[PDB]
């Protein structure tokens, strides 16, 4: 029989391993051109303490018109302070995060963090403009927001011993 602790022990080594790798990759740069940062993967793992939830939300899907809460995630990787907005996938992922971020300055390790860069269609309808209510679209900066899916795991370190392990293993 395999013990359930082996799940907690696999994510122990999975979090710390992916932390070292991606931490270095984020210091180096997120995808230098066509995949050439350091270790180019879709999902990363890092550590930071909870800042705040922004009062505003982000429209993540136009078809089904859903907006997701902003969990402000800034941390100093090496020299640079990477300040990007942590997002949730579903309503269940949003609610578990807001119920988890009850403690401010909560130092946790966000595992399996899937980065999403903003974009849209670009050629224009030029037709069926009867649906329009007179509203010309404003200029939005296409930023990358760090999405948290249902495969993600946010591990809270109540102490600073796992933080100690990670920062001394990575080094800057």
């Amino acid at each position: 029989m395999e013990i359930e602790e082996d799940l907690n022990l696999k994510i122990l080594e999975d979090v710390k391993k992916l932390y070292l790798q991606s931490f270095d990759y984020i210091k180096n740069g997120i995808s230098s051109g066509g995949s050439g940062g350091s270790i180019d993967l879709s999902r990363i793992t890092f550590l930071y303490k909870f800042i705040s939830v922004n009062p505003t939300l982000l429209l993540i899907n136009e078809k089904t018109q859903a907006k997701r809460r902003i969990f402000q995630g800034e941390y100093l990787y090496g020299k640079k302070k990477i300040q990007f907005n942590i997002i949730a996938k579903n309503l269940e992922i949003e609610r578990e995060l807001i119920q988890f971020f009850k403690k401010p300055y909560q130092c946790y390790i966000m595992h399996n963090v899937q980065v999403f860069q903003m974009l849209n269609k670009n050629k224009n309808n030029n037709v069926v403009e009867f649906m329009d209510s007179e509203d010309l679209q404003s200029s939005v900066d296409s930023q990358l927001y760090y999405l948290i899916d249902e495969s993600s795991h946010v591990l809270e370190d109540d102490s600073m011993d796992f933080i100690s392990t990670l920062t001394r293993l990575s080094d800057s």
Binding site: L59, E62, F116, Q117, M118, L144
Partner: peptide, 14 residues
């Protein structure tokens, strides 16, 4: 369909 699926305002870096 899906929040981050086809018809999203954001696509995964890959």
């Amino acid at each position: 369909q899906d929040d981050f699926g086809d018809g999203c305002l954001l696509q995964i870096v890959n």
